Structure formats: structure tokens, C-alpha cells
Amino acid sequence: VRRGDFVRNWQLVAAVPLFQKLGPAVLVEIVRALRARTVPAGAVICRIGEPGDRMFFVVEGSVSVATPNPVELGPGAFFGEMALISGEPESATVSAATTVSLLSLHSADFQMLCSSSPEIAEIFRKTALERR
Amino acid sequence: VRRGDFVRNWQLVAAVPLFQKLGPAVLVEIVRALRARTVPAGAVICRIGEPGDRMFFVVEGSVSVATPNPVELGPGAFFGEMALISGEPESATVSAATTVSLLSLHSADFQMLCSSSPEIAEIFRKTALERRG
Numbered sequence: 015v016r017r018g019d020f021v022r023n024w025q026l027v028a029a030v031p032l033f034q035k036l037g038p039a040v041l042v043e044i045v046r047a048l049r050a051r052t053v054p055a056g057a058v059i060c061r062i063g064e065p066g067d068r069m070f071f072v073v074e075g076s077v078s079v080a081t082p083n084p085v086e087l088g089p090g091a092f093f094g095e096m097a098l099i100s101g102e103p104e105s106a107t108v109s110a111a112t113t114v115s116l117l118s119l120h121s122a123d124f125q126m127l128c129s130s131s132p133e134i135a136e137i138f139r140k141t142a143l144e145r146r
Numbered sequence: 147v148r149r150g151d152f153v154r155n156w157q158l159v160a161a162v163p164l165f166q167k168l169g170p171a172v173l174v175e176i177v178r179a180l181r182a183r184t185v186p187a188g189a190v191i192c193r194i195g196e197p198g199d200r201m202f203f204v205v206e207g208s209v210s211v212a213t214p215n216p217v218e219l220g221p222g223a224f225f226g227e228m229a230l231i232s233g234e235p236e237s238a239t240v241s242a243a244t245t246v247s248l249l250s251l252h253s254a255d256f257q258m259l260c261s262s263s264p265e266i267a268e269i270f271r272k273t274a275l276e277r278r279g
């Protein structure tokens with residue numbers, strides 16, 4: 015990881031309350047694994063039916079989940095967790111509702127996070143079930 | 147280190163350009179060792195003749211170095227390096243000029259910083275000589 019992206023991530027990570035549950039050591043691992051991304055309003059982030067190799071956290075702006083009755087997720091929310099939990103394809107297309115700032119986490123690092131944090135693992139699990 | 151202090155340190159170290167010379171791994175060890183402090187305007191930070199066991203980095207506000215002609219140091223500046231390098235007592239009293247936000251580093255962690263970053267070590271050494279002369 016480059017120093018520029020790393021230090022930038024620390025500022026971005028503050029926008030996701032979920033990570034307040036991590037101690038310094040685990041926080042560093044997650045911050046090292048996260049990748050910042052800006053998506054313009056209306057643009058596809060993930061597509062229904064596709065294999066999920068990563069999940070996302072919303073920093074700023076919002077996204078639109080294309081369920082029958084679409085759901086708009088805001089800062090602090092996460093999406094892409096269902097496929098990572100079930101192994102099944104992406105259950106819905108998710109697009110930028112407004113221009114959105116994101117933090118992406120790959121499946122391997124997602125697993126490491128859940129292994130490191132029982133509390134966070136269950137939040138993902140309950141949220142996925144609630145969404146299913 | 148507490149999670150709160152750790153996370154707050156990341157925001158504060160951004161104000162110290164010197165630390166841009168550190169990669170992610172060394173940066174973490176430094177952020178772990180730093181302690182944040184706010185000092186009210188006019189209040190003593192360093193005392194002349196006192197043994198040096200730590201140094202400081204200015205995050206916000208400014209400090210006044212009590213040399214014959216006082217020097218006001220601003221954000222990104224450092225002080226207390228001279229005693230740590232030479233082993234001599236503090237060369238001058240340093241006080242908050244305005245209310246100041248600081249980051250302090252103990253002597254043991256100063257050694258770690260200098261070893262991890264010989265570039266930074268050189269800045270300290272040259273600056274110390276400059277301030278000495």
C-alpha cells in the first residue's frame with residue numbers, strides 16, 4: 015500500500031461507524047486493505063447476477079439498490095455483503111444515487127475482518143438476513 | 147494505546163509535513179507512540195536547564211522559544227530535539243504563544259523514529275546545529 019492512499023483512508027474510515035468496533039491493530043489491517051473510489055451519479059457499482067468478489071462502505075453521498083422497491087443507502091452503510099456471506103451471485107444492481115465516495119473491501123480481507131471481529135461478523139449476518 | 151487516541155492521532159499527524167517521509171508501517175509505530183496535548187496560551191511546555199526526556203511537534207497554534215531573541219514556532223515545527231541529540235539539558239524554556247495543539251514523543255520513541263527514518267534523523271541533527279549556532 016502507498017502512503018498516500020493509506021493516510022487518505024484514515025480520514026475516510028471515520029465516516030463508517032461500524033469500524034469504531036475495531037481496536038488499533040485490527041483497524042490498521044482493514045485500513046491497509048481498503049481502496050477508495052468515487053462513482054459519478056447514476057453509475058453502476060455492482061450488477062445483479064454477477065459473482066461478488068468485494069463489498070463496499072459508503073463514505074459520502076448515497077447509493078441506490080435496485081430491489082423491486084429500491085433502497086437508498088447513506089454514509090456509514092455497506093453493501094455487497096450478501097454475496098460474500100452466501101457465496102451466491104449479487105442479489106441486486108447497486109448504482110450511485112448521487113456522486114458517491116466509497117471504500118471497497120475484497121473477499122479475502124472481508125473474511126479476515128469477520129474472523130478478527132465477532133461483533134462485526136454478526137452485524138453483517140443479521141443485516142444480510144434482514145435484507146434477504 | 148486507546149482506540150480513541152490512536153484514531154485522533156491520524157488527523158493530527160497530517161499537520162506535520164515531516165511525517166510524509168514515513169511509509170505505512172513506520173507511520174503506524176509513530177502514531178502509536180505519539181501523545182496529543184493542548185496547552186493554554188502563555189503556559190510552560192519545556193523548561194531551560196531541565197533534562198530532556200521527550201520532544202514536541204506543533205499541530206495547531208504556536209509556541210515561543212525563550213532564547214535572547216525569542217523564536218515563534220508554527221504548525222509542523224518541532225522542539226526539544228537538541229537535548230535528545232546532545233544529551234545536554236534543555237537549552238531554552240518553550241511556552242505556548244497562542245493556545246497550541248501538540249504531539250509529544252518520548253526519548254525511547256525518538257530513537258526509534260531516527261533509526262526508522264535516517265532522513266528525519268538528519269533534519270533533527272542539522273536543525274539542532276542551526277539552532278545551537
Ligand SMILES: Nc1ncnc2c1ncn2[C@@H]1O[C@@H]2COP(=O)(O)O[C@H]2[C@H]1O
Nearest residue numbers: 066085093094095096097104105106145
Ligand atoms: N432488501 C435490501 N435492502 C437493502 N439492501 C439490499 C437489499 N437487497 C440487497 N441489498 C444490497 O445490494 C447488494 C447486491 O449485492 P449482494 O447480494 O452481495 O449484497 C446486496 C446488499 O448489500
Ligand SMILES: Nc1ncnc2c1ncn2[C@@H]1O[C@@H]2COP(=O)(O)O[C@H]2[C@H]1O
Nearest residue numbers: 211217225226227228229236237238277
Ligand atoms: N535559536 C533557536 N531557535 C529556535 N528554536 C530553538 C533555538 N534554541 C533552542 N530552540 C528550541 O527549544 C528547545 C529547548 O529544548 P532543547 O534544547 O532540547 O531543544 C530546543 C530547540 O528545539
